[PDB]
């Protein structure tokens, strides 16, 4: 009961279904690894290293493209330093230094693109003050950016005209991206793709269900954060915040099928920080020895593992240092194995 | 501080005035009306071409073509009468969250989680669709899009703002700010002069597209709302909220008139839409079945069933002659 013209339309729809089925088969070899963790934990740095080890996509122009962000970083860090200085009401020893603050305080961070001799001289003179040094030594309260020591000791290497950022430097810049960043790559005929959800500031309930049935969750926790408190609220523990997030994550039904792996980071700072601070002061429960990295690491890992409501999920862990390159090269090789075997595809097995 | 108490006093003034206006309820007037009775509905067609859960679809003005958006990074156009497929188009940013169809039949708008709503030119030489304008600038995550003509488009995202864009120029023209939560849904009036937007603060707002100032604010719900849609005549609108109690508000009297509620339901609301005549309200539930409620009496009239997961979207054709449903199963179903 048809005509002799719609048969072309039927042929077209048949050939479009035949086109769709190829993409159907094509999209059965991917494993999305959803990354999570609170701020400043280091979520982006993993993606960056990851890009370096396999993609190897960095080029001289791409490295150059970050200079502006480098300047922005150095200025925002320094401005935070001045704000912290004036917050704690600490007297200055040099009169010129007091004047040198007005010229650097009310500066639009975004507009600045290059240096002249004035800003270099200002920063050099400001850094010399032992008041700034002691304020840096008291960086507990005001939560200054962690990666400020590297830049503030090498300002002259940036002040030159022929500036090319090096491979080491680029791994510490923080690039402002609001949208989620997705990085696909392929190893051994398996395409991995991972996403980042640290850039969204709106309510979580609305967009979370869009992530149903992800294969794996990779949680990231910072070790050195444990002793940071905030003036605004009389009691403030960054650890408790991350613990509350972790407790919330496992109670959503959306992720019951997915396995949970929790990485720890910043172990190096931890081994350079415990030498004059006592964990027992912060947490009464601890009773072991002092000046011990092993005891604190074991305690933290034990407590996170113990904070599992279901008690039927075997959560794994590793200790890594974010800046290093061989450590990640080995830990990711480990996780590949221990995740690929524990994953299966049904394929009409009922 | 005195500003806060003055605001409280103005709130008391507006409350007492609106209370004074309300004389009688709708139920008392609507006692002497013959009921609808019992209506059943049958499945006439099953369109199946996706590999993932469906988020949005929209009818065409022609009343024959429909466009559906899925998570597979591909959105496809279906012909409703004979189920065949005309245009399957891939899109780059694989996390989509809304679709929209041009009244002219030349464009298709899609938006998502990457904050870039890419407009697609359909009718072109060489017979391959291409991206026309990579409209950008908004921050957060887009939630919906509705054409007003072949040029102006309204957008709403998670930045607590509504923005009007021009496709040719590519830059913002007017911002409708003033919310505090997050905007969820849009709905254009038939005359294309006024739209209302509901926020996550349990508050609706009516906007004037010309002047750019919020004409009227509507409080009343106790939780976030999810769907808004105008009465066909353009004098009232219905709202669906997570408390499961849909509600109706008229513009002229500036107060709520009638509430739908029942005890056996506790789930949220995904979609709401009147019919062409105006006496029926199709609502969509999480209990896997959508319900048809009569407008003026608050009784039920039947059930549509057939799905395994929640119903994500509804669509009523301009002729009031068919209803499409899209649910999280990669299936679309047309009811008559």
């Amino acid at each position: 009961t048809l005509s002799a013209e719609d048969k072309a339309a039927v042929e077209r729809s048949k050939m479009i279904e035949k086109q769709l089925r190829r993409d159907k088969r094509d999209a059965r070899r991917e494993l999305k690894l959803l990354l999570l963790g609170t701020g400043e934990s280091g979520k982006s740095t993993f993606i960056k290293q990851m890009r370096i080890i396999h993609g190897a996509g960095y080029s001289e122009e791409d490295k150059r493209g970050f200079t502006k962000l480098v300047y922005q970083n150095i200025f925002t860090a320094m401005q935070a330093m001045i704000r912290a200085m004036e917050t704690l009401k600490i007297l200055y020893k040099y009169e010129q230094n007091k004047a040198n603050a007005l010229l650097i305080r009310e500066v639009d961070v975004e507009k600045v693109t290059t240096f002249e001799h004035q800003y270099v001289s200002a920063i050099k003179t400001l850094w010399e003050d032992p008041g700034i040094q002691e304020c840096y030594d008291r960086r507990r309260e005001y939560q200054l950016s962690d990666s400020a020591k590297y830049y503030l000791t090498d300002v002259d290497r940036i002040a030159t005209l022929g500036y090319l950022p090096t491979q080491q430097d680029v791994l510490r810049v923080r690039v402002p991206t609001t949208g989620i960043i997705e990085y696909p790559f392929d190893l051994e005929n398996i395409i991995f793709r991972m996403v980042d959800v640290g850039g969204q500031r709106s309510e979580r309930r609305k967009w979370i269900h869009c992530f149903e049935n992800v294969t794996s969750i990779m949680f990231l926790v910072a070790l050195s954060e444990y002793d940071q408190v905030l003036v605004e609220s009389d009691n403030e523990n960054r650890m408790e915040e991350s613990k509350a997030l972790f407790r919330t994550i496992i109670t959503y039904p959306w992720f019951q099928n997915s396995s949970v792996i929790l990485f720890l980071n910043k172990k190096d700072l931890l081994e350079d920080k415990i030498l004059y601070s006592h964990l027992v002061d912060y947490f009464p429960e601890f009773d072991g020895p002092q000046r011990d990295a092993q005891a604190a690491r074991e305690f933290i890992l034990k407590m996170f593992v113990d904070l599992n409501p279901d008690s039927d999920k075997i959560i794994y862990s590793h200790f890594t240092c974010a800046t290093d390159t061989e450590n990640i090269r080995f830990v990711f090789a480990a996780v590949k194995d221990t995740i690929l075997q524990l994953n299966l595809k049904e394929y009409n097995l009922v | 501080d005195q500003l806060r108490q003055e605001a409280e006093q103005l709130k008391n003034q507006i409350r007492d005035a609106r209370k004074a206006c309300a004389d009688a309820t709708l139920s008392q007037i609507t006692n002497n009306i013959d009921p609808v009775g019992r209506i059943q509905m049958r499945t006439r067609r099953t369109l199946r071409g996706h590999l993932a859960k469906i988020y949005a679809m929209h009818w065409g003005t022609d009343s024959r073509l429909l466009v559906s958006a899925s998570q597979d990074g591909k959105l496809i156009i279906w012909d409703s009468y004979t189920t065949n497929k005309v245009h399957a188009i891939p899109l780059r940013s694989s996390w989509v969250m809304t679709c929209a169809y041009a009244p002219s039949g030349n464009y298709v708008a899609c938006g998502g989680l990457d904050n870039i709503c890419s407009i697609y030119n359909l009718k072109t030489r060489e017979g391959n669709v291409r991206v026309s304008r990579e409209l950008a600038g908004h921050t957060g995550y887009l939630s919906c899009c509705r054409f007003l003509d072949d040029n102006q488009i309204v957008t709403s995202s998670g930045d607590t703002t509504c923005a009007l864009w021009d496709i040719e120029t590519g830059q913002q023209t007017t911002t409708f700010t003033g919310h505090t939560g997050d905007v969820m849904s849009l709905s254009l009036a038939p005359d294309t002069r006024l739209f209302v937007s509901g926020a996550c603060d349990a508050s609706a707002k009516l906007w004037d597209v010309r002047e750019g100032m919020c004409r009227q604010t509507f409080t009343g719900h106790e939780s976030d709302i999810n769907a808004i849609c105008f009465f066909p005549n353009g004098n009232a609108f219905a709202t669906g909220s997570d408390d499961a109690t849909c509600r109706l508000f008229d513009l002229r009297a500036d107060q709520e008139l009638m509430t739908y509620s029942h005890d056996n339901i506790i789930c949220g609301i995904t979609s709401v839409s009147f019919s062409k005549s105006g006496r029926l309200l199709l609502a969509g539930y999480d209990d896997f079945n959508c319900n048809v409620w009569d407008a003026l009496k608050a009784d039920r009239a039947g059930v549509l069933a057939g799905h395994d997961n929640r119903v994500s979207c509804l669509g009523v054709t301009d002729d009031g002659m068919a209803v499409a449903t899209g649910s999280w199963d990669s299936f679309l179903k047309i009811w008559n």
Partner: single-chain antibody, 232 residues
Framework: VQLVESGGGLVQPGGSRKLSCSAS????????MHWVRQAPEKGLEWVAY????????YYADTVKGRFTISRDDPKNTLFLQMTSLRSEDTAMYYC??????????????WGQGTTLTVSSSDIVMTQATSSVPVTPGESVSISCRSS???????????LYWFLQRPGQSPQLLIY???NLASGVPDRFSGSGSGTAFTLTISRLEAEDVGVYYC?????????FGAGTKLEL
């Protein structure tokens, strides 16, 4: 947006002859092509047709078993092989284009064409008039009868209307008896009853003179009509 052919010259009876139609500038993979004959002293005649992806091939009855067309999509070409050419095969050959879905307009764009010389039922349409002395400044009416009710159950009528300026290639004017192809001024408009369709050129302008061609597409093999020649 350009189609160029080759393979023109002289051939001897009892041989072989390849003809090539190129294609540059579009998504060639999804365009069903045709072939069109034009005798130097008569109207038009359908030759053959290839579908998309070689899923369908048709032929005119008068030529079955002598020709063959193959499409090479990776390099975007189209070959027609002829064997045992007869004396009546001298003509002008046109390569065309056509896409079939809902609301699209087939026969948009026509090739330049190649000449070929040699040495040594089905729905029939009709034309009621030949010469028409034009009157600039007024309206003109052209008519075409048929031999079958071209109306179908779906409610559309598969009659078309062409134009061919002298020394050029024909372009589409009216498709499906009511619409107009995008690229023509709005003066044209066709109205007709089921038996007969008429076109009404309102307010004639200079350089509009051309030989017209009624064409139907109900069922293959689609044929043409002799048409009318405007003169002044």
């Amino acid at each position: 947006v350009q189609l160029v052919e080759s393979g023109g010259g002289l051939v001897q009876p009892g041989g072989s002859r390849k003809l090539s139609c190129s294609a540059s500038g579009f998504a060639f993979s999804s365009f069903g092509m045709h072939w069109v004959r034009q005798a130097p002293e008569k109207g038009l005649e359908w030759v053959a047709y290839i579908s998309s992806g070689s899923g369908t091939i048709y032929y005119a009855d008068t030529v079955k078993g002598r020709f063959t067309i193959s499409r090479d999509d990776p390099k975007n070409t189209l070959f027609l092989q002829m064997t045992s050419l007869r004396s009546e095969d001298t003509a002008m050959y046109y390569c065309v284009r056509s896409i079939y879905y809902y609301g699209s307009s087939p026969f948009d764009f026509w090739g330049q064409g190649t000449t070929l010389t040699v040495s040594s039922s089905d729905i029939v349409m009709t034309q009621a008039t030949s010469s028409v002395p034009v009157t600039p400044g007024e309206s003109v009416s052209i008519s075409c009868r048929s031999s079958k009710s071209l109306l179908h159950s779906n409610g559309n009528t598969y009659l078309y209307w062409f134009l061919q300026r002298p020394g050029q290639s024909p372009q589409l004017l009216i498709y499906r008896m009511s619409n107009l192809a995008s690229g023509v001024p709005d003066r044209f408009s066709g109205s007709g009853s089921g038996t007969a369709f008429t076109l009404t050129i309102s307010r004639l302008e200079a350089e509009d003179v051309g030989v017209y061609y009624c064409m139907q597409h109900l069922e293959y093999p689609l044929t043409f009509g002799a048409g009318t020649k405007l003169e002044l």
